[model samples]
Target: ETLKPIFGASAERHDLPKYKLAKHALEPREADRLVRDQLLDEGNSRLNLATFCQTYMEPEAVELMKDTLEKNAIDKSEYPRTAEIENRCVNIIANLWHAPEAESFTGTSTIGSSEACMLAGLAMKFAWRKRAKANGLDLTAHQPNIVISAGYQVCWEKFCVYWDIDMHVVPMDDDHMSLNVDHVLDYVDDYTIGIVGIMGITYTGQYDDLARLDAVVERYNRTTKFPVYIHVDAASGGFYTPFIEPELKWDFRLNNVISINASGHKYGLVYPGVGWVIWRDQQYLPKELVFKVSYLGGELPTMAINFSHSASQLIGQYYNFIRFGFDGYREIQEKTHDVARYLAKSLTKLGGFSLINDGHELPLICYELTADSDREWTLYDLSDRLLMKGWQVPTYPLPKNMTDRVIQRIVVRADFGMSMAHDFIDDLTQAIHDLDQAHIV
Candidate 1:
């Protein structure tokens, strides 16, 4: 009894109450088991089709990130090499996005693209304010606005709310899933900060025809005194589109696209908690937003709203760059594209669904129930059925104006291989069979 195993009652085996600290300390092994046990019923990350976040990486990169977990990203002086690694990641991404060779481009790593978006949004706002002031416009006449598509991510909404900027969403009709390029200028004025052109729009994996949008902005700029620039929110596509479609005009190559933000964790082939934002040149970012920090015998420019975080994610990003060179990323992304296209074709063959996006733009599939099928259950029910087999597929209504239509989205990651795709289709067919046969309560 005295030598009972770690899980036995003799080791004070009572369910620990959450939200309160325990009076006594358990052995390290016992604590580990207790924590592990708490997550026994959670869904598997590998099979989660709902998230754009990555679920897998090579063991070597994991080991490197694990070893560097304690390194603080903000402490440039203490960890100079870590800072240089971050710098290298910025340079790699800037080059990948085709930052102008003659221009002095700059960037920084944030907690994730949420923070990256925040930083970019702030820059746009601050730069707009500066120009408005110089042009002698009364600041109090109207609050500044940012025009974006209705399919924007929550981060943009949060940015507007947090900063008191007016977010004017251009509605997405059934025909147009991306930004309404034709009506975008209708929302612009002296009070507008910028227009956000989404690359890989979250809801449908559709692009906003940025080249056309860029031309529209250029046309608008010619007629207006207060020029509105473009900040491309490439959170999902920044790292992806480059590898897949090198000729896409959604990046800095477009003249009016002054800034771009992306999630390194999403398609950058790294784990969560890392994002990057780069300015096409140093001038697009307002100097007031950047702080000169002189500490621990070093001087550096810090622009992110987040002050401190584990440098491991950024290191992981760099590791990905070094490990998966241009060709490697291209190959990986192409395979993912093939998987999504395969899923789209297989699911189409399964019937009763209409394709919103067929994985041609981003490596993802989005679909809705066909009007003619008249299934007994909704996509929500399908999502629940999929969850029973340890898959987490998500179903949600489309944004703002198109709330009436619900859609299911499957984000195909690099780890979601062809075999798994087949297995998922098998399970999907089984789920459909189960739903079709079962009596509705």
Candidate 2:
């Protein structure tokens, strides 16, 4: 077959350059084609279960961001409209979480959830320091620490290390994969800046019992010289719980939950490169932490660890808020929850797995091999087999205390429809059968 000359190809596909830059620049079109070709064989996002990030967005949202590639979101004066949308986003999220002072709450967009987490941690640390200073307490007498669960996402660890704060971990066991409310207070001390109550645990998709945890913190606050606050790391469940289970008292409804961080990229149903952090009010965010920046004829208070990112994601978040108001989001989330329940039930019928967490809080299932599966393969083997069919299920050991067990997880995003769920179960069934027939311990 004679292939007509490709639009911008100067050589056969295999002969294209994949090494260091050439002596001179090629046509922009050829460079684009070359890079696109290299990535053409990558796994499909729809089949990637290892991620909680969104895989689909409306084409109009893409169009909204199309001409914004060169705009700088940080320059508020230059892009005042972008700044307005960003503020609207903060207000929208505050209302979603039922913040009492939504009109006066403080928030900003971040590069992603990690940056949002850092900002929240810093705010608590600064507030603690300021309070200790006001009371004339010795600063170095006690080392500062932040309490979180063993199943915490990596960003908290990064926050602790970056600021030289001690990360006190509440241990996890098979029976207690989420944070134990009873023991959470045991980890708090005089120098504790705050407690990180997770709305959704990364490993098991279980919540840290925020309301109960808050009650524990509330009692502890009365006895402490310097009070510790709660920073809800709702990176995954921030958007999930609010819509699916509005009755869940995990957000600002609890007094101790002074601050919260969430990924707009995750359950916010937007693409990556967006996250949000909101304080209960201006007082929770120390003024010292807010740096006054001079940009384009005006001064602004900025409090992000990551500055100068695209404003498109923030705008997209606003679009979602308006495009899918309370009812629209509620429907999408309820559907996701129902599909996840169906997936979990079908997997249970297979009879060789136990749920690490039932995934009622979020649309995902984290499960481990049963004690008496009577099979030779591990979760890791199952992960490998699933990959043969282009699935990206992840398998890993539970946190330290529960190292004896291994788990595999399937994240059901908005894009993973009912048809996809059934398809996954078929592949899962076949993979187990294949492994059983070919294996011996």
Candidate 3:
């Protein structure tokens, strides 16, 4: 046979040892068929809403992503073109965030917000050390601290512990689930590197008052020589806020916000594994943090923790920039909020839940069962029951200070259209009715 020399008779022997055969022995069509069968048999058919990342991609973007994957990621020599595309994305975002016209802003892409957070932390530490040296302070004498709300993502805590920086958490109580501007200001001093203002808190979908925090930082700067700057971790709402709440002055427009990081996967409408970090001015980014790599007939300064990744998602982001532009993004976000509000309103009508936030601005709704309802079921039970119906809702306790409260949250992304919402509401109503019938109370 024609394949005898390559397969050595193994290709004709179906009973041969599976491990001994070359991987190429299986034709592409056969391998695909096997995988498809397995997927159809074992995978759960469900609508997932557990996290904020994009769970659905537009068909055009998907085709582009698949095509980019067909060829390997663009080579390093072509990175300059990729870099230019990324730069355009940054400019689009900067303009949305209301960055000053006179100041020159710059940004870079990373694997995700975690790496972006680390880079921002590193920049803050370097900037602090520089300031300390200029003022004749001893860096070795004491450990510096980053002041932030207790609701911060775990990544910040990891950054502090990994770098040996003290994490000063400002406790948020029932009254203040978001960061309290005055309390955060009280924590700042010479040893404090920076304060983080969260735009979309993961637990409650609450936003810290960045404008008020900016005023506090401005006041601090005016009175003290050892001024502290601000870094915004807008991982969740970084993309949502600009399109929905354009009038909000929480970004580079604020005088004290030196740096910001966001997740493109969260609201940039791209698939997972893409994030961005931007500095309001070149002066804020330390020169030492950037490393020059040889590429495209010249040296380029690259600032990312990861290298060698497919450029598909980058291309997807750029496509979104061109396709959605400004109004398109606004319309999508507006519809997202509309669906979230409808869900929230319907859940409220059920009369056994207390809606924490209506998600008028955000695309997620968080609610907890009424404490006085006296039912045998909990949000956990509800989550499990919903899973049986192909709905992947997340149920978890609040932050450390509010652990007594248990809540269920639904994150409505772009893929979840009005039709999906209608179906979801019908299913939810039926589920609640079932729950009521099962229990007497």
Candidate 4:
């Protein structure tokens, strides 16, 4: 058969069907070109400042991940070594969070923090049910609830909905941008499952005072029959905080914080699609949710909501842990923090913006327009102008009680270096210039 040039092929002349596969097959090169062309107009991920997801990883890490793309994470019997790597990652994370030496802890990798959050939520609910039944509480009278601040990520809401639990939210005012420790216990009762103290609140990049919340929970547990615990949704700050702020007591170090979830992709320095969830002790993760599968020579335990998935992201996570040992991770996170602070400081000096979060807790920045600064344009206008230069600084309203106010946020990842930050500021300045001069009808 005579091979036609890819561009001259019949398949190249027509549009690809969106809903179904095309009837005829195309040459491999032509199909590759078609897919590449489809993605040509999308936003470049490396320049996206609007997300907490990690965008870049070392080429070596990518190569390692690519080699293990077909390994199934759930098939422990067939590929025991890959499973061991996942176990090692969990142990490393537990130690990083200072899991108690006397307790038996266990964890697993999820697709992302969303799945991790779901697993933690399930564990919390099951453990609560067991305790409630033993304590003789009327489970049928009312629906159980999970307590979280207004600034919680959307997954918690999904968890509450999917599991038929109430999302009892603590409202966020200007005074309390994070979980209100003073008012948190007010939402808890006999039917309360758990309270989620976020390590990094998604909207503002602020840390909920977990230490204080733990203290409050400690006191509450002393009096109540249905004792409640905490699940730290450290999706953004989990991997970054222990290295940057080792002195902070937001993890298992706090008595009531029984389990935690974090995106390995976010700050574990790998690309997206891996998250970690660990119970401080075996008792925190109820046995009812775990399945002991007898496969090959051994009985392996599994608890993830997802059954089968590619092991590449977890292997990539393991690669990061190996490649960037304790000091190396700290160095990279510290530099990222420096970049965040630099961007926050530079933007603050640019005039109209008021800093909501200045990257003190997590390597991200959130700012709003100063009430006194006379600005003709809104943040939406600024966002559009910045997008013209390939930057994705997002502007959204604050959550819950503070939704009346609007702000812009920038999430700084490990790969977003100082040079790129400088470039962003240049574009931001030009955006402001363009917006300031434009006439509005």
Global lDDT scores for all candidate models: 0.90, 0.85, 0.81, 0.90
Candidate 1 has its poorest 10 consecutive residues by lDDT at 1-10
Question: For candidate 1, what is the TM-score?
Answer: 0.97
Question: What does candidate 4's lDDT look like per residue over 118-161, in tens digits?
Answer: 99999999989988899998888999999999998889989988
Question: Candidate 2: worst 10 consecutive residues by lDDT?
Answer: 1-10
- Show where candidate 2 strays beyond 4 Å: 1-4, 7-19, 294-298, 372-374, 439-441
Candidate 4: C-alpha RMSD to true structure equals 1.4
Better of 1 and 2 by lDDT: 1
Report clash pairs, candidate 1. none
Report how far off residue 283 is in candidate 1 (Å).
1.5
Candidate 1, 349: how far from true, in Å? 0.4
Residue pairs in clash, model 3: none
Per-candidate TM-score against the hidden true structure: 0.97, 0.94, 0.90, 0.97
What is the alpha-carbon lDDT of model 3 when measured against the actual structure? 0.81
Better of 1 and 3 by TM-score: 1
When sorted by lDDT, best at the front, the candidate numbers are: 1, 4, 2, 3
Angstrom error of the Cα, residue 143, model 3: value is 2.3
lDDT of 1 by residue, 134-201 (tens): 99999998889999999999999999999999988999988899998988878888999999999999
